[PDB]
A paper describes a structure:
Here, we use X-ray crystallography to study LuxO, the central quorum sensing regulator in Vibrio cholerae and related bacteria. LuxO belongs to the subfamily of AAA+ ATPases known as bacterial enhancer-binding proteins (bEBPs). Here, we present crystal structures and in vitro and in vivo functional studies of LuxO that together reveal what is, to our knowledge, an entirely novel mechanism of AAA+ protein regulation, in which a regulatory segment of the protein prevents substrate ATP binding and hydrolysis by occupying a portion of the enzyme active site.
We determined the 1.6 Å resolution crystal structure of a V. angustum LuxO construct lacking the D domain but containing both R and C domains (denoted LuxO-RC). In the V. angustum LuxO-RC structure, the R domain is nestled between the two lobes of the C domain, forming a discrete interface with each. Interface I is dominated by an interaction between α-helix 5 (α5) of the R domain and α7 of the C domain. In interface II, α4 and β-strand 5 (β5) of the R domain interact with α13 of the C domain. Strikingly, residues 137–142 of the R-C linker occupy a substantial portion of the C domain active site, sterically occluding the binding of the ATP substrate. Gly 141 of the R-C linker appears to be especially important, as it not only makes three key H-bonds using its main chain nitrogen and oxygen atoms but also occupies a position deep within the active site that could not accommodate a larger residue.
Author numbering: 3 to 123, 127 to 220, 224 to 388
The structure:
Amino acid sequence: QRQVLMVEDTASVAALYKSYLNPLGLNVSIVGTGKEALSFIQDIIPDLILLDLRLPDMTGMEVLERVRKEHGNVPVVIMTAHGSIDIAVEAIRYGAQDFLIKPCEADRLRITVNKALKAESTSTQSKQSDGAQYQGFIGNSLPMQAVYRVIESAASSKATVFITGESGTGKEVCAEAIHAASPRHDKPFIALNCAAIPKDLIESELFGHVKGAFTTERQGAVEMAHNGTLMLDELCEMDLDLQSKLLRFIQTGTYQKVGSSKMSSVDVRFVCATNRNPWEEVQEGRFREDLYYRLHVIPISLPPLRERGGDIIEIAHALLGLMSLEEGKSFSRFSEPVLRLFESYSWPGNVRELQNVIRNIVVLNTDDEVKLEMVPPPIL
């Protein structure tokens, strides 16, 4: 059983976060001081440390320093309030793997923990900027609460989940949430983006191929995903010929590797996503109607940023830390007039536009605080 050490001196928060992790079937140990965390580690090296920056006997940075003096590999995820993004960024620079903005929600914590444990000891590869909060999957606006509700109900079912929403609204992270809350959480999570692959290769990427299939026997997504979750992202980009083979695979669980006539089978739970209107794609003859009704079982609609109220403040704070790290700067807060302006703007490009705007600010300015004079058009 994997071990997570939670260094958290607020007992109610530690209990809440431990309850969030219940679906993952882990051994979670709570300590409330740096002394007790370091004592634990002398005996048992955990598979992950969740480390609050604020502790009664020493700072979280001091814990991190003392851990890294003897343990260079154990993953550390920092838990921080808005007010300590400056310290969270310095913690990453010193040797921590990611930071989580508090308060945290159940799905975001499960995704972060599951990704940190699988990265160490096989799912689709992941890095820091792939973290849930940077993709917009953070906050407790009513529209997001509706998403979390469906994830919780659906995760335990094998029924296919069909995710819609504009580009950059959190659809891929929503699929990771389903996986982490499901009984398949410890099995592979495989995401294939159907737009990211050329058409002459996507059948091979999905179903594998044998040696000399086209100008050695490689394993496709369906095989990598066996007993786990297969996510088909940007699914409406798939061509009609491949759609017919996908429908056959969904119905029968059977497939052929490219270049082979041999029949193979796997057991996957399906999630898919599109930023198109899927029924419109059916009406226009671009998407098979039978495939639509086969897949459109448990629908989830991600709300755009303009419908999510105060969530934008949380995402912006996460991204300010991420862009400071990426661009070698030390921004850690926004002025209140900047935040008011971010709340009034409708973000037509959703999280990608938010990332762009914050990156532009961080590249062009050197400050600890984002001020109104830094905000580009068309925001102001």
